[PDB]
Amino acid sequence: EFALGGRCLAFHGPLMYEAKILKIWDPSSKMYTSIPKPQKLGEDESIPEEIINGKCFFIHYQGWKSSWDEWVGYDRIRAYNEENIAMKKRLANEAKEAKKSLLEHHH
């Protein structure tokens, strides 16, 4: 599952990346929890209407600047586990193979 400060994997574009959960949104109470206590969305805060009715998570991608931080739903977020890690690796290798394929047949 997903816990505050816990690791997770998330799609950003067609590939998956490791991230850290900083906030957990509850669609019902319209309040999220945070790591240094539920609270509503602040003056300059917001969640995409595309995912706001579901459980959302505000994540920070490991090794990326915080300006990339964002809310994601069960749409793009996945549990940090062997099966999803394998999925991550598999997509990487498929793109590696796709790259190899067209780079040759390019000319």
Give an account of the 3D structure:
The protein has one helix at 82-105; strands at residues 7-12, 15-26, 31-34, 56-61, 70-73, 77-78. It is built from one helix and six strands, in the order E-E-E-E-E-E-H. Helices cover 22% and strands 32% of the residues. The chain has a single domain (1-95), classed as SH3 type barrels. Strand 4 (56-61) and strand 5 form a beta hairpin. By secondary structure, it is an alpha+beta fold. Residues 37-43, 97-104 have a biased composition (Basic and acidic residues). Belongs to the MRG family. This is Chromatin modification-related protein EAF3. Component of the NuA4 histone acetyltransferase complex composed of at least ACT1, ARP4, YAF9, VID21, SWC4, EAF3, EAF5, EAF6, EAF7, EPL1, ESA1, TRA1 and YNG2.
What's this entry about, in short?
The protein is an alpha+beta fold and 107 residues long. The protein has a single domain (1-95), classed as SH3 type barrels (Roll), CATH 2.30.30.140.
Tell me the number of structural domains: 1
CATH class: Mainly Beta
Q: How is the CATH topology named? A: SH3 type barrels
Q: Encode the helix/strand succession as letters.
A: EEEEEEH
The DSSP helix count reads 1
Strand residue content:
25-35%
Q: Would you report the number of β strands?
A: 6
Report the major sheet.
Answer: 6 strands, antiparallel
What is the terminal-to-terminal distance?
A: 47 Å
CATH architecture: Roll
Q: Indicate the structural class.
A: alpha+beta
Apparent shape? elongated
The radius of gyration over CA amounts to: 16 Å
Helix content: 10-25%
